[PDB]
Ligand binder design. Sequence first.
Ligand SMILES: CC(=O)SCCNC(=O)CCNC(=O)[C@H](O)C(C)(C)COP(=O)(O)OP(=O)(O)OC[C@H]1O[C@@H](n2cnc3c(N)ncnc32)[C@H](O)[C@@H]1OP(=O)(O)O
Length: 197
Amino acid sequence: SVCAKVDAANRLGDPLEAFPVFKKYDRNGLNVSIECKRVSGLEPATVDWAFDLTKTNMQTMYEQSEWGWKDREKREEMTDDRAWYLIAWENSSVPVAFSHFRFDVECGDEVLYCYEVQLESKVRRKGLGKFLIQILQLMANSTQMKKVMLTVFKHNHGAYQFFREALQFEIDDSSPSMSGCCGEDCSYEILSRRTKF
Ligand SMILES: CC(=O)SCCNC(=O)CCNC(=O)[C@H](O)C(C)(C)COP(=O)(O)OP(=O)(O)OC[C@H]1O[C@@H](n2cnc3c(N)ncnc32)[C@H](O)[C@@H]1OP(=O)(O)O
């Protein structure tokens, strides 16, 4: 059942274990190791770093959206027991990028939902962001999720092109239609990529 696959994925110790060669990224002057852990397996400073980076990167965009920036609410989302983190480490010490994701039931399907993918400014445009989303798609396959899903702000033109063009995400059926937010277009789109099987 749908329940069963989601529960099984959340019982994994290390979902990235099935793809050992993807635990390193050494391209374009980057040399990082990549780990996948429950939020419970991170040091508090790492969780704080991830939140701080998201706020630095996203606060202004949230403020111009229908949601606003909810400081406490974002911290609680990112520290939830069900959260998984993909973290890229430089020099065995310094976190420089992460994705926070969950295995969940979304519009009735077993899906890997990506809440955040965030990179430090200094490591952007070197393929690492694409690599992290690739890894999410690998994990979706090995756990037999039906899609990887996420939400993007349309005003975030870079991230929008990143997902729609570079990664060929499509607009999900759950994305609110035109005139869908209080009689007007929503500032965001829900995007997805189906797993192939
Ligand atoms: C669910 C989410 O979190 S939605 C919000 C996404 N996160 C943010 O906006 C936070 C700040 N930005 C980032 O963290 C990163 O820049 C990301 C995640 C958006 C993209 O990761 P990056 O590593 O920088 O991109 P990456 O190097 O992998 O780009 C691959 C391709 O995506 C496209 N792309 C990436 N960034 C851009 C951009 N700013 N403008 C246009 N196209 C882009 C390009 O086609 C690029 O290929 P190219 O360099 O050969 O032209």
